[PDB]
Amino acid sequence: LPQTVRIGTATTYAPFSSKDAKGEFIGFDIDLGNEMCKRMQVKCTWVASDFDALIPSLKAKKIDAIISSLSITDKRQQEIAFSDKLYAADSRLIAAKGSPIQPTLESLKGKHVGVLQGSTQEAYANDNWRTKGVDVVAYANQDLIYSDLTAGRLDAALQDEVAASEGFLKQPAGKEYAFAGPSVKDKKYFGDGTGVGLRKDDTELKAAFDKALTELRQDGTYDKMAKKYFDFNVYGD
Numbered sequence: 001l002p003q004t005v006r007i008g009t010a011t012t013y014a015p016f017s018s019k020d021a022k023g024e025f026i027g028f029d030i031d032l033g034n035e036m037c038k039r040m041q042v043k044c045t046w047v048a049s050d051f052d053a054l055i056p057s058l059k060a061k062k063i064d065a066i067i068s069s070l071s072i073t074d075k076r077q078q079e080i081a082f083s084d085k086l087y088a089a090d091s092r093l094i095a096a097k098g099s100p101i102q103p104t105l106e107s108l109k110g111k112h113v114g115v116l117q118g119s120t121q122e123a124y125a126n127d128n129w130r131t132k133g134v135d136v137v138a139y140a141n142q143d144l145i146y147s148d149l150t151a152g153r154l155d156a157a158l159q160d161e162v163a164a165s166e167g168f169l170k171q172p173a174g175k176e177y178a179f180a181g182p183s184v185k186d187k188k189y190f191g192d193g194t195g196v197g198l199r200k201d202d203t204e205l206k207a208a209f210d211k212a213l214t215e216l217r218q219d220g221t222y223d224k225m226a227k228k229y230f231d232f233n234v235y236g237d
């Protein structure tokens, strides 16, 4: 293992990764990463990036790990390796309170839908919606999506369910918005929860992460950390 492990993350996805008022990194990803590093007995430097630059930066060795709500998908496994699951992550639509919008082509054709560049939601939205007449608009960071929704530039926005819920819907800025329909289920696109993204050849680093995460889950540190953010089981199955 390196003495310093460099972890990239996109700090605009509360409550998993964001910045406090002084610019320090906060969220459940941060806590998980810092707790794993503690147990791996390495130093960890967090590195902020747009989400869609994370996997390119990992391939170029500018970072060594990604902890950024990075969903474990089949396509991504072709390019990088993953730790064991850190938590589950369903996708879901948000729109203005009272809107009839559903995550269907029939409901969304002609409306403007925000998605994060590089995400599984952009992959899904591009294939099923954008080609068929939905104005799918891709954003560099998720904060910009929420803002464009509250200004009425967007009709709806597709992102991880818990990020939307805890990072926006339950905040003042999303008081007048809600989920539009239930979770969009599509195991192909959205993957099997999130994990630490790693280079394929870094078997020893993956092993160290996987073992730290088992240890912090076994002794109950996971749940203590998660209760700061969630009143439900974020881990899943």
Ligand SMILES: N[C@@H](Cc1c[nH]c[nH+]1)C(=O)O
Binding pocket: 010, 013, 051, 068, 069, 070, 071, 072, 089, 116, 118, 119, 120, 121, 159, 160, 194
């Ligand atoms: N979990 C999804 C959505 C996401 C946006 N930012 C971080 N994650 C993905 O890995 O693409």
